[PDB]
Symmetry: D2
Subunit: 258 residues, 4 copies
């Protein structure tokens, strides 16, 4: 059954997070066949500017993600940045996310695999798809059983990303493949993304074949303290989920095996 990873890019506030957690609960009720997982970063450890929003800290974040899980019965995924953050995070996160810039930091991957939780690894903007076989190999060595590789775009010149859809079938050979619909259309350092392309590339993803879609959402995308240009309006989620399910239905029959 299809995996949908949704949430706010960052934990801007517990009030905002809970509101977003409500739409996902409602959505899981409407799409019984989809496996939903609530996502949110407790820290933007890689912002370009020292002036940008980062977060309220690990403690606060883990506590807020807990509220969402306890109040909505939703599984959780959040990203970690240094080794020591795995265990504490593993307390509430069902899936530990590894940032794209860190997909090669051996200790971080090992730390995460060691918690016993599932691990999703954002493919680096510098990584060739075949080069992800070693990422999985490390996680496996570290104890990881539920492994995920997430397509999030490849460096295409300066301040731009391209999604080479060949990566989906190649990566499926070693792990469940996920398509990150929001960061893939993001233009890095662009102000120091293009929301209109989010939906069309998602359809491409499911036509090609993947095991899940990752998409960030916000009640007021233009007021988002992070990834504003690319976060989707809460009201748009429903329509996109339906199209994924419909496109997957008629397409699955053609997904290449293995």
């Amino acid at each position: 059954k299809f995996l949908v990873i949704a949430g706010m890019n960052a934990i801007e506030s517990e009030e905002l997070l809970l509101k977003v957690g409500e739409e996902i609960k409602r959505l899981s009720e409407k799409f019984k066949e989809v496996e939903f997982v609530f996502k949110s970063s407790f820290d933007k450890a890689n912002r370009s500017s020292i002036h940008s929003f980062r977060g309220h800290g690990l403690e606060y974040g883990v506590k807020a993600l807990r509220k969402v899980k306890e109040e909505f019965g939703l599984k959780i995924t959040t990203d970690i940045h240094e080794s020591w953050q795995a265990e504490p995070v593993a307390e509430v996160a069902d899936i530990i996310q590894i940032p794209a810039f860190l997909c090669r930091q051996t200790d971080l991957l090992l730390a995460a695999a060691k918690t016993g939780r599932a691990v999703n690894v954002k493919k680096g903007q510098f990584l060739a798809p075949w080069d992800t076989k070693n990422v999985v190999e490390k996680l496996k060595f570290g104890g990881a059983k539920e492994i995920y590789l997430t397509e999030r775009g490849t460096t295409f010149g300066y301040n731009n990303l391209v999604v080479d859809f060949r990566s989906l079938p190649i990566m499926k050979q070693w792990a469940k493949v996920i398509y990150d619909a929001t960061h893939s259309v993001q233009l890095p350092g662009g102000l120091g993304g293009m929301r209109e392309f989010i939906f069309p590339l998602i359809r491409a993803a499911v036509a090609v074949g993947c095991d899940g879609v990752f998409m960030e959402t916000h009640p007021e995308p233009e007021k988002a303290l992070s990834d504003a240009s690319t976060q989707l309006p809460l009201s748009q989620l429903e329509g996109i989920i339906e199209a994924i399910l419909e496109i997957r239905e008629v397409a699955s029959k053609y997904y290449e095996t293995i």
Copy 2:
């Protein structure tokens, strides 16, 4: 009315051209809501090696095309390489094709636009999507009425191309878009990988395009150009049905330009 441009990369032997030509005809008959067009090049004026198969001349070509156009009643399309080849070829081809490397050559375009026939420009591997607008403008200024833009991959480092599927909705702003499913999986001087041909076609119809461009051959390993990318004639039907199904569902979400 989805447009499907299929055929042999080049005219190797009219016998094969007819074998592929009847197969198309059969399909055009099964899929009546589809408009087929027979594609094939009378010459390969852009091969890397000097020892590579080119063609049997514009004469033998234009002749072979009309032979298929009459024996099967299928619309024809082929590409021109120099300003002159326009007029002579517009006598058998309904769609004049402009090569990828020549998409910026003002006079070649200006010419094919005069023949009154429809024009299809392969987007250069060096062109950014939003740059195809000027290509359209040149042709309109030249009398082109039915204009087509074709996605065929972009230079992604050395000996490799990538398909930026954002180009489809972008070029759709000023022309009908075609997705080249065979040259896009091709590896420049590598090459190509037939294993990705179909998956990306699926991607193209899911995103939304006005048609696809494929190339088929009775048995690829025998092809004389782009052999590792040529699609086996048999599979051609399964694919056509596949993208029609996907198109039926996907079109409900195509953005409105």
Copy 3:
């Protein structure tokens, strides 16, 4: 000796074409160690907009060139966009130039090789350094004797080119190499002139058989490639620099 192809990007006029031929002449006299070659195009056959300047036809073209070739005694070179322009242009052009986008068009290559002239091929923005081998194999077959490969940048994402300086030694394995100092910094569909010089020093330091650069008396008033056109009054300086760097670096140029 060292090659220095200079001149205007386009033949905006025979008047201006001369003001430039005069300066190239002077520099030609001040640096007897360098083989200068006047260059300009009679037709910008590949402009982006249909509304952009092209030239005054092959007529006024070869006309203006032949004039400089006799009034200043400088060798001349220009680019052809279709096979027929080969022999007719090979009347005044010592070096026939092949545009970047056309570098794989066999007939344009064979047609230039026929004329028995020197053929300089702009390496396409879509071509790998090593793929230029066949481009030289095509010219040999076509009767070419004096061949050149020009580095003019590689497609780097949308509307941008990067100069992979590894090509210089790679290509030098089968052809003399020229570096296009003005087009290698252009932004397809735009340009940054502040990088023209720096990259030239980089080209000679690595090692090349010659430099290719376009100049104009008043760049801001140019009708083609305004942004990437050295103001005539700077060519001399740059040329002194290329020689100096070439003298110190020569010693280190690898060996094919």
Copy 4:
């Protein structure tokens, strides 16, 4: 005073390190106009394979680097991978190196700046040159006073890097610039090209930069990392000589940022 950062990629063993340091010492004596800074990693924390050499631990690596500083009187530099590593490393490092994949990791940048030591950031392969400004601003925010940016290539298609030398003058506006002659010709996940190392250094000094970074090993074929890109310890002298020579004549043309 031109800066030459040199040493062996990883601290393979203390003896092998002292051997390289002996040579670096010799060079600092012969080239008194150059400022040599010895470099070596106590840990390869980003190896593609779980089976590759990483190192003998921080403590071991800090002792070795200190033995090289003490015995040969050379300045030291090494890279850090997690915040906690900054402080202990600063006891010996004159310059704290920040890995390319980690160049956007704020807490690591801050941790290094807080030590009071100079900081040299490897420009990420996904970073445009103008994006480094925000990097230099994070460091100043953290207390860094002496800052360096190192050009080490940019992602060019898969398993390949290209060096855009327009990045030197661009980055010189915010920090002193070093050119990494070793990783720039490296082919990521390819298994580099040793023959291109010297040519690119020449281009680098010609264009203009405040220093060059080059790893060296006595027996490159037996290196436990970056084997294909480490220079034979016997070639360094030639390179440095040529560099000073090129810089000598080229220096006057460096454009005043």
